[PDB]
Swiss-Prot record:
Protein role: Acts as an effector of RAC1. Associates with CCR4-NOT complex which is one of the major cellular mRNA deadenylases and is linked to various cellular processes including bulk mRNA degradation, miRNA-mediated repression, translational repression during translational initiation and general transcription regulation. May also play a role in miRNA silencing machinery.
Location(s) in or outside the cell: Cytoplasm, P-body
Species annotation: Homo sapiens (Human)
Protein name from the UniProt record: Granule associated Rac and RHOG effector protein 1
Quaternary structure annotation from Swiss-Prot or TrEMBL: Interacts with AGO2 and TNRC6A.
Source organism, top-level taxon: Eukaryota
Length: 289
């Protein structure tokens, strides 16, 4: 339908907007991809001379990536989630953003076990992630009752459908894909989760606005040199170094009038911004007690 078409154009538009991060080398290949292919073709024994040539090419690719990244500034990007709705589209838009293997798997595919460890704020109530000494079942029961009560203020309400959206198995792959579309370069720059000091500051927020349930899930990701590529090049590999930090806000809206009318719900939205209104929301979420 039109929702799916809009989503695909949003993934294409993201990859096109930052395509300067994925420029091919002088020999027409992405340099990191060339390194990995030669490591395979040379049976893990790249001779010393080719290794130096490759390290020189990779130095230049990393310099170009950094200059291109700077040239993008810090604008807020937006796209739809929904990658599972069109595997062929997302694989096509991820070309050059991550490995061919990871692109092939991206389109292809929940709370009972994950929700207890997720801290989440429902309305005005902060609900902790379970501690080892606490009943996970009781943590779950409190979360589902608070969810239900937000709407009552069980079987008839979409409690599970909303709470599924704060489970990492639902949002985390989609957020990683968004950051890859924008900032990845296959074989050279990879996306991973950032080290968060206070997990509770990143707790998702669930709110009731009129007849709409709004789920907001914040996260932060790092851009790093591709560790396999750097290890194959016999380079100094500091796994803690980052080329940048990227803030992401995932927003899912369940319209309760559409739910009972059986009408189509909107796809989740993803907002993305390189660290130096996503920023306003980040500051509203981090300030919660
Ligand atoms: Mg472009």
């Amino acid at each position: 339908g039109a929702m799916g078409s809009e989503a695909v154009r949003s993934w294409r538009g993201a990859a096109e907007a930052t395509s300067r991060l994925r420029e091919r080398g002088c020999d027409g290949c992405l340099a990191g991809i060339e390194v990995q292919q030669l490591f395979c073709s040379q049976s893990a024994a790249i001779p010393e001379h080719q290794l130096k040539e490759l390290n020189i090419k990779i130095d230049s690719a990393l310099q170009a990536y950094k200059i291109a990244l700077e040239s993008l500034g810090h604008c807020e990007y937006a796209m739809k989630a929904g990658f599972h709705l069109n595997p062929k589209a997302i694989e096509a838009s991820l070309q050059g953003c991550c490995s061919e293997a990871e692109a092939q798997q991206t389109g292809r595919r929940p709370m009972q076990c994950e929700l207890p460890t997720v801290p989440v704020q429902i309305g005005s109530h902060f609900l902790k992630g379970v501690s080892f000494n606490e009943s996970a079942a009781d943590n779950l029961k409190l979360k589902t009752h608070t969810m239900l009560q937000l709407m009552k203020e069980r079987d008839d309400f979409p409690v599970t459908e909303v709470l599924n959206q704060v489970c990492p198995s639902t949002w985390r792959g989609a957020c990683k894909t968004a950051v890859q579309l924008l900032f990845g370069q296959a074989g050279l720059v990879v996306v991973d989760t950032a080290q968060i000091e206070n997990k509770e500051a990143y707790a998702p927020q669930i709110s009731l606005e009129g007849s709409r349930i709004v789920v907001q899930v914040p996260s932060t990701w790092c851009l790093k040199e591709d560790p396999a590529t750097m290890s194959l090049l016999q380079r100094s590999l500091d796994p803690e170094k980052t080329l940048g930090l990227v803030d992401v806000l995932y927003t899912a809206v369940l319209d309760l009038n559409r739910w009972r009318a059986g009408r189509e719900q909107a796809l989740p939205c993803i907002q993305i911004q390189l660290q130096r209104g996503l920023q306003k929301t980040f500051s509203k979420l981090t300030s919660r007690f």
